Amino acid sequence: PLELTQSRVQKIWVPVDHRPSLPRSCNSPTVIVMVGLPARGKTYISKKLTRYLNWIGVPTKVFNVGEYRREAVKQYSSYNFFRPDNEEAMKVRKQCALAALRDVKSYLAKEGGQIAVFDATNTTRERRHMILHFAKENDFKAFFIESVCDDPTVVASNIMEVKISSPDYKDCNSAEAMDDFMKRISCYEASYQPLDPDKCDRDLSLIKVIDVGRRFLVNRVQDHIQSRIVYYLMNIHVQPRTIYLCRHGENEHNLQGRIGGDSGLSSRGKKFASALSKFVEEQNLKDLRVWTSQLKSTIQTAEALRLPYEQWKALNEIDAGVCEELTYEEIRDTYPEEYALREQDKYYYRYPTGESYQDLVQRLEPVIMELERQENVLVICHQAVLRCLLAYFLDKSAEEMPYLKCPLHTVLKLTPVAYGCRVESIYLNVESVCTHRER
Amino acid sequence: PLELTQSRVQKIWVPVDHRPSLPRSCNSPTVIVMVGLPARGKTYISKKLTRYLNWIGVPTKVFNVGEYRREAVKQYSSYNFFRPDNEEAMKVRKQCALAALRDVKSYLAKEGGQIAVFDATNTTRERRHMILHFAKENDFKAFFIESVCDDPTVVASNIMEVKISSPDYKDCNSAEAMDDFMKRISCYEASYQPLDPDKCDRDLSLIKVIDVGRRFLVNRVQDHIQSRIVYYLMNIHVQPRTIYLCRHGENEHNLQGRIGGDSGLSSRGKKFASALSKFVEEQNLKDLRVWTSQLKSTIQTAEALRLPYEQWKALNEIDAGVCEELTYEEIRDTYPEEYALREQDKYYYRYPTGESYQDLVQRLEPVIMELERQENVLVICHQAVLRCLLAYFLDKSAEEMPYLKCPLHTVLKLTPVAYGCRVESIYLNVESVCTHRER
Ligand SMILES: O=c1[nH]cnc2c1c(-c1ccccc1)cn2-c1ccc(Br)cc1
Ligand SMILES: O=c1[nH]cnc2c1c(-c1ccccc1)cn2-c1ccc(Br)cc1
Ligand SMILES: O=P(O)(O)OC[C@H]1O[C@](O)(CO)[C@@H](O)[C@@H]1O
Ligand SMILES: O=P(O)(O)OC[C@H]1O[C@](O)(CO)[C@@H](O)[C@@H]1O
């Protein structure tokens, strides 16, 4: 009579499943279609969106047709391979697109993937009609993301930042690679049919990203995930900036080996806070936003900076529930079953009346969205919160996330470059205890 | 040396403020400009957006030029008042717009308002240039929301739903009011200059809502609040649906007068769950989404429905921190200072290591966004969570929110109609304790 049991790891109430003598086991995936001329940031969008979607828990994978081409055709010689009159290479390129779609079908229908990002030019109505046919026959949704930018400064910058360094241009110098790539773009210009939501593409679910996100044309958003993608694309930018991530200075609970709580900075923690102020000053940043949690130790650290700061409840350390203010030895002795369950499944494990790393991701999502909108930001937080944010920026999986090394009195300087983050570590030469525990 | 104190009500760590002998006390507001012909849902957008922004904690107010006109000109006779050749009424209408802007300045610069929604036609470039001049001179941001829809079915439906019932048409029958309103729309058509983000309005921050949210043109989103508005407008719809809100059936903690915890349904709670299934069945809904919290009592209630349901951690009852599983008598005797602080400031009060109603709003925001996207939804939740959701739908203030009456074994049936919600209460004839406590 409505009998439930609480699952040991995640602490989820499930109906008591008294399976009979013979136990029996018993929404639609999306193909995101990238659209646009080369050097329009399609791969940049594909990679960043995939990184965000995976981090929030939506299994996402990129299928880049160019990588299938590099695999089918050993070495790249020139733009001549991309010529519309190149009958043989046109057959090869089509075969590569079809092979990528085959892997899209396998990913979405057989591997538990939810979103497949089809990263190609898809510049002709013919190619897009074929992708739609493929989606309709496989019961997949189709969502188009077109990037429109004809600014020559933006095109040249994209070639210099990520095209000249491509495996295709290994034997080329910067000038030859740039010249070949401009000719390669020209191969696509004649047959390019932009998305037309006014007449031809009126019934398609699409986003037209115009001039690096200055303007957007949004047509027929069908569901939750498409709506989320659109909101994300509207919040991200390519302006140069730095993200500094650190934990509060060493606290009294750190000295006692106690988890959670709301203890204050130790004498060393206060020394780090002074060292952090000097470090921040030496960075010579025009403007800098400072974010803390609502816990004392991060606020005391920010107080040493003499800069305005904003407290976020979303940045508060993982809630250990009944295990709050206990040492790991006291957890193992009072709750041995709980201790072993966490060690076996650190990401999904939920503390009783507490949280999991999975819960942390959900509450840090608005932090991530705001970090994307901002420029120079310093986030003073906690060990588990920091691992979660770092996993987003460094594209780390749910499995590796609870084990990322985030020592005390150490600043993680993140510089967005090419298709990810350059990470520099800066230890501020103040002693502390070690709170890192390996698997 | 980084000395902080925790504020008694909100539990916020603040620098110990040792004010000297003579204590001294010491971002830009936004004008949202509605654009479009009459019967385009501008007032609908204004009211709904204001309701959402206020609920999330952004002080927002609507300034409807027509209400200033109804105040300046006692009785409305006909569309002749709106004629472009009506020199006198054109002077009166301009004076009303200027008087509304005067009140916009006072609201944003002197009353602590953050967003002013300027609800008028603002169909000419001249009027919009004047509003921009007003915004620039007062250091206010300007964000334009244009609603474009020329579907005669949509226009006729808007006139029938909310125009014919306007105080202007009190002495008129449905046919005369509809005829007069069509003529009134025609008065605006000749001088109407839609927003042109391509050439003329390229530097303006705007959203063009096309065909009741089927399509959007988004130009130059400057900040966080504009980005949030755009996301909200993309999630809302006018499709007919019903929202059912109720608490879990009576639990064991309810019988003991204990707060929080994760107790199961009492015998009466199980009887409500059966009664709820019968009620749901009798509603004869084609499709229905069922949402619960992750707490046992709501899941057991949903289990009785024999329908698929989704558990949301965001729907979990307010966290009472150290006061969890205690009766109110035990709270008053163990924590008398805490008890009195809560009674004095129920919305902002945060339980030690727990939450406030203010915290609840922040974590329920994704619930609200998803409720907007959906159609028929049944939310099985908890007393404080329910008050928070109800305050959103019923446009209740932060001050009234902790005192809204949400009894056990009672379904709140919400039907979106005109500019809000019709609320029907359905008691399912199962006895329970009373958990309501007045101020
Ligand atoms: O080249 C480009 N053209 C046009 N839009 C571009 C790029 C790049 C880019 C940035 C770094 C390297 C290579 C490419 C990113 N976006 C972009 C697109 C949409 C959004 Br919303 C944000 C950024
Ligand atoms: O008449 C209309 N024309 C055009 N758009 C309209 C309406 C109404 C409406 C609904 C009920 C009563 C009166 C008006 C709402 N929206 C609307 C606008 C934008 C979004 Br995003 C969602 C709904
Ligand atoms: O997930 P882990 O490795 O236990 O680390 C999280 C813990 O780290 C701390 O931030 C410091 O020990 C605790 O407050 C928190 O419980
Ligand atoms: O804000 P109030 O009036 O104390 O009501 C919230 C309380 O109501 C309950 O849902 C039932 O008593 C408790 O779990 C919760 O603490």
Q: Is A183 on the interface with B (CB under 8 A)?
A: no
Q: Which residues make beta-bridge pairs with B207?
A: B145, B218
Pairing of strands B309-311, B289-292: parallel
> In B241-387, where do the E strands start and end?
243-247, 289-292, 309-311, 377-381
Phi, psi of A116 (to 5 degrees): -115, 120
Q: Quickly tell me which residue has 């090419």 as its tokens.
A: A418
What's the A388 CA to ligand 1 centre distance in angstroms? 25
C-alpha closest to that of A45 among A161, A209, A206, A196: A209
Q: Which amino acid is at B204?
A: L
Instruction: Kindly determine whether residue A221 and residue B230, on different chains, have CB atoms separated by under 8 Å.
Output: no
Residue A198: closest C-alpha in chain B: B215
Contact A393, A421 (CB under 8 A): yes
CA distances to B41, B157, B177, B416 from B161, in Å:
11, 6, 12, 12
Interface test with A, best of B7, B148, B212, B218 (most A CBs within 10 A): B218
Residue in B6, B215, B295, B374 to test binding to A, most A beta-carbons within 10 Å: B215
3-class secondary structure, B380: strand
* Three-state DSSP state, B335: coil
CATH number of the domain residue A254 falls in: 3.40.50.1240
- The ligand that comes nearest to the alpha carbon of residue A416 is 1
Look at phi and psi of residue A32 and say left if phi exceeds 0, alpha if psi is from -120 to 50, else beta.
beta
Annotated binding site of A for ATP: 36-44, 158-163, 339-342, 383-387, 419
B147 lines ligand 2 (CB under 6 A): yes
Residue B10 forms part of a structural domain: no
- Where in the sequence numbering do the catalytic residues of A fall? 119, 149, 248, 317
Amino acid at B122: N
Q: Is the dihedral of CA B434, B399, B384, A318 positive or negative?
A: negative
Q: Whose CA is nearest to atom 5 of ligand 2?
A: B212
Contact B109, B29 (CB under 8 A): yes
H or E stretch covering B143: strand B141-148
- Dihedral-angle region of residue A127 (phi above 0 means left; psi in -120 to 50 means alpha; beta otherwise): alpha
Around Cβ A431, how many Cβ atoms within 10 Å?
A: 10
Q: Find the domain containing A402 and state its range.
A: 239-439
- Which of A221, A238, A255 terminates a domain? The answer is A238
Q: Is B427 known as a binding-site position?
A: no
Entry resolution in angstroms?
A: 2.3
Domain edge (last residue) among B218, B238, B258 = B238
Amino acid at B345: D
Instruction: Point out the residues of B that are catalytic.
Output: 119, 149, 248, 317
- Give the span between the Cα atoms of A229 and A56, in whole angstroms: 12
SS3 assignment, position B124: coil
- Structure tokens given for B86: 């009506």
Beta-sheet pairing, A215-219 with A115-119: unpaired
Known binding-site positions of A = 36-44, 69, 93, 121, 127, 158-163, 184, 188, 247, 254, 260, 328, 339-342, 346, 357, 383-387, 419
Name the token pair of B167.
């105080």
Nearest to B28 by CA among B194, B169, B224: B224
- Among B238, B373, B417, B421, the mutation site with the greatest number of ligand 2 atoms within 8 A of its Cβ is B238
Residue count (chain A): 439
3 state SS of B248: coil
**What CATH code is carried by the domain that includes residue A231?**
3.40.50.300
Distance of alpha carbon B10 from alpha carbon B228, whole angstroms: 26
Place of tokens 């159609």: B375
Does B427 share its domain with B320?
yes
Whole-number Å distance between alpha carbons of A403 and A346:
9
Q: Clarify whether residues A223 and A243 are in a common domain.
A: no
Residue (of A149, A150, A93, A81) closest to A122 by Cα position = A93
Q: How far apart are CA B44 and CA B59, in angstroms?
A: 18
HSE of B159, CA atoms in CB hemisphere, 13 A:
21
Q: Verify that B227 and B315 share a domain, yes or no.
A: no
Q: What's at A74, amino acid-wise?
A: K
**Residues B328, B334, B340, B341, Cα dihedral to 10°:** -110
Counting ligands in written order, the one closest to the CA of A325 is: 3
Residue B141 host element (H or E):
strand B141-148
What technique was this entry resolved by? X-ray
Angstrom CA distances, B142 to B56, B206, B234, stand at 21, 9, 20
In this structure, are A227 and A306 located in the same domain? no
Helices B357-373, A224-233: axis angle to 10 degrees equals 110
Residue with CA closest to ligand 2 atom 6 = B41
Cα–Cα distance, A224 to B80 (Å, whole number)? 46
Q: Is B38 annotated as a binding residue?
A: yes
Structure tokens, B247:
């608490």
Q: What residues does B148 pair with on adjacent strands?
A: B210
Known binding residue B387? Answer is yes
B40 with B151, same domain: the answer is yes
How many structural domains comprise chain B?
2
Same domain, A347 and A381: yes
Distance between CA atoms of B251 and B84, rounded to whole angstroms? 65
In a domain, B285, yes or no: yes
Task: Tell me: do B177 and B249 sit in the same domain.
Answer: no
User: Is some CB atom of chain A closer than 8 A to the CB atom of B148?
Assistant: no
Q: Among A258, A259, A387, name the best residue to mutate to test ligand 3's pocket (greatest count of ligand atoms within 8 A of Cβ).
A: A259
**Token digits of residue A261:** 């709580």
Dihedral over Cα of B54, B60, B62, B68: its sign: positive
Helix (H, G, I), strand (E, B) or coil at B341: helix
DSSP-assigned beta bridge partners for residue B216: A218, B209
B253 shares its domain with B377: yes
Same domain as B230, residue B308: no
Convert chain A into a string of H (helix), E (strand) and C (coil).
Answer: CCCEEECCCCCCEEECCCCCCCCCCCCCCEEEEEECCCCCCHHHHHHHHHHHHHHCCCCEEEEEHHHHHHHHCCCCCCHHHHCCCCHHHHHHHHHHHHHHHHHHHHHHHHCCCCEEEEECCCCCHHHHHHHHHHHHHCCCEEEEEEEECCCHHHHHHHHHHHHCCCHHHCCCCHHHHHHHHHHHHHHHHCCCCCCCCCCCCCCCEEEEEECCCCEEEEECCCCHHHHHHHHHHCCCCCCCCCEEEEECCCEHHHHHCECCCCCCECHHHHHHHHHHHHHHHHCCCCCCEEEECCCHHHHHHHHCCCCCEEECHHHCCCCCHHHCCCEHHHHHHHCHHHHHHHHHCCCCCCCCCCCCHHHHHHHHHHHHHHHHHCCCEEEEECHHHHHHHHHHHCCCCCCCHHHCCCCCCEEEEEEEECCEEEEEEEECCCCCCCCCCCC
Question: How many angstroms separate the CA atoms of B417 and A88, rounded?
Answer: 62
